[PDB]
């Protein structure tokens, strides 16, 4: 009879509770307080226009109807309990495929404190859209948005807020990097309120600031370019007796001009506009093709 | 819905004070209590920041060191305990409520202390 | 630590017309700065939370206009009680508040 006393405990805690009713329901307004930590920052695709990441999702709430008293000033119960009481509708507004893992049971973690005040944290994995715009590719830096909040309980049943300071709640670990192509210089959070056609919710908004880096793109495609050109300039010393050698460097040049860059823009998006790696490409081939019809003229 | 706050008093320069600061209407765990100095005819200046549900708390590194918030969830009270006082520490310190989008939106009335 | 410079220090108009207070923050700000009213020996009151919210209680003539660096208050029609200390503060990150600004009529 050493647990008898919690399974009693347990029992008068939920005899009488209807999990379909929000605390609350027509005499206040229920709080949420959230929270990020993010494990990982997943990496980004390009052509998708998405990126992934991994978070420790916190909510705290009030509910006056699971208030107990006994020797432990906190229950850390399982996460079948969740599924027994009434827990807040969270969805990301931009998410594309999110899973919630269950390995090897349902991470989630539920913990009880005797005046009524409920932590429960899950640990999922978020695809979310990231709309870029490439003018500057690749030397250009982005904001890739997450924006959650409530579906079904509009302002006037459920608000949200940020549990600490909104410039100390998201809060990125230090390991937690996979990529490889870009950097992510800080974080930035928001609150707002949209409206959509069955009333108005709130959001919350979190940017993640990253910046492409160059090292790569260099090496692949800029300074070939300019090795080409200088090849190409190199003719201007030959003897102009020697007229099939020129014309097969004039010729070859034009060639690699046209694999290089055909090899080149397979890298990024089927975007509709031009790029900066396009402007360089086009001068580069406006001068190696002056270069042939300077040929041409002397 | 209402916040209690002490009695103006003197005190002498290298003594110690303890201003009380009392919530009715309202449990003190379920939100933050900022401390509030405001010098005659300046601008605001934050003090310190305490979660009285947890207990770890924030000053301002100007009062680092020199001041401690406290709080007692039986009385519902919150203290500020000031140490080591000089001559610029006459002004008006106000007890606040965190609520409605990180606004503070509810104040105490004050307290004047004054430095012989 | 975000400072947060008010402008101007004060201004003296008439009763009816349209006034507009000005604040502005060093670093990024996303809309959590709080208007306070202070009158004459009394404690300061909440005007406006978020940067466009008017607290439960306040009259329809205060409007807030914000952004991530840059707001504004703007108090159409005036009254003759509407004279006090109007604070701009933020809440981002660690609390702080502007220098203030006094109305004299």
């Known amino acids: 009879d050493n647990t008898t006393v919690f399974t009693r405990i347990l029992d008068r805690l939920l005899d009488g509770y209807d999990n379909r009713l929000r605390p609350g329901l027509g005499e206040r307004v229920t709080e949420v307080k959230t929270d990020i930590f993010v494990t990982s920052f997943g990496p980004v695709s390009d052509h998708d226009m998405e990126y992934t990441i991994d978070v420790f999702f916190r909510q705290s709430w009030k509910d006056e109807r699971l208030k107990f008293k006994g020797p432990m000033t906190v229950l850390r119960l399982n996460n079948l309990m969740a599924s027994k009481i009434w827990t807040p509708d969270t969805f990301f507004h931009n998410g594309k495929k999110s899973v919630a893992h269950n390995m090897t049971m349902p991470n989630k973690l539920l913990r009880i404190t005797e005046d009524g005040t409920l932590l429960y944290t899950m640990r999922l994995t978020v695809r979310a859209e990231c709309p870029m715009h490439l003018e500057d590719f690749p030397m250009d830096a982005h904001a890739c948005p997450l924006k959650f909040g409530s579906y079904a309980y509009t302002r006037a049943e459920v608000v949200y807020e940020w549990t600490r300071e909104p410039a100390r709640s998201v809060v990125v670990a230090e390991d937690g990097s996979r990529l490889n192509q870009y950097d992510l210089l800080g974080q930035t959070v928001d609150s707002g309120i949209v409206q959509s056609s069955t009333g108005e919710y709130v959001v919350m908004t979190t940017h993640f600031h990253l910046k492409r880096k160059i090292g790569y793109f260099v090496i692949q495609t800029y300074l070939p370019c300019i090795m080409t050109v200088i090849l190409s300039q190199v003719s201007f010393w030959l003897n102009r007796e020697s007229v099939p050698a020129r014309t097969v460097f004039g010729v070859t040049t034009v060639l690699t001009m046209t694999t290089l860059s055909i090899s080149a823009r397979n890298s990024l998006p089927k975007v509709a506009y031009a790029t900066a790696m396009d402007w360089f490409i086009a001068v580069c081939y406006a001068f190696v093709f002056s270069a042939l019809i300077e040929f041409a003229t002397v | 819905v209402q916040l209690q706050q002490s009695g103006a008093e003197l005190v002498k320069p290298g003594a110690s004070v303890k201003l009380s600061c009392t919530a009715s209407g309202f449990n003190i765990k379920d939100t933050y209590m900022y401390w509030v100095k405001q010098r005659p005819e300046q601008g605001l200046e934050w003090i310190g920041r305490?979660?009285?549900?947890?207990?770890?708390?924030k000053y301002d590194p100007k009062f680092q060191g020199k001041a401690t918030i406290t709080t007692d969830t039986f009385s519902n009270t919150a203290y500020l305990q000031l140490s080591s006082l000089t001559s610029e520490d006459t002004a008006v310190y106000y007890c606040?409520?965190?609520?409605?989008?990180?606004?503070?939106?509810?104040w105490g009335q004050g307290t004047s202390v004054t430095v012989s | 630590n975000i400072v947060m410079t008010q402008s101007p220090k004060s201004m003296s108009m008439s009763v009816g017309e349209r006034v507009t207070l000005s604040c502005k923050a060093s670093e990024y700000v996303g809309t959590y700065v709080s208007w306070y009213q202070q009158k004459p020996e009394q404690s300061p009151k909440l005007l406006i939370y978020?940067?466009?919210n008017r607290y439960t209680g306040v009259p329809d003539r205060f409007t807030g206009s914000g952004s991530a660096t840059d707001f504004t208050l703007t108090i159409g029609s005036v009254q003759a009680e509407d004279l006090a200390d109007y604070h701009c503060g933020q809440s981002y990150s660690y609390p702080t508040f502007g220098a203030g600004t006094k109305l004299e009529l």
């Open positions: 606040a409520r965190k609520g409605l989008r990180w606004a503070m939106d509810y």
């Open positions: 978020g940067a466009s």
């Open positions: 305490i979660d009285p549900a947890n207990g770890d708390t």
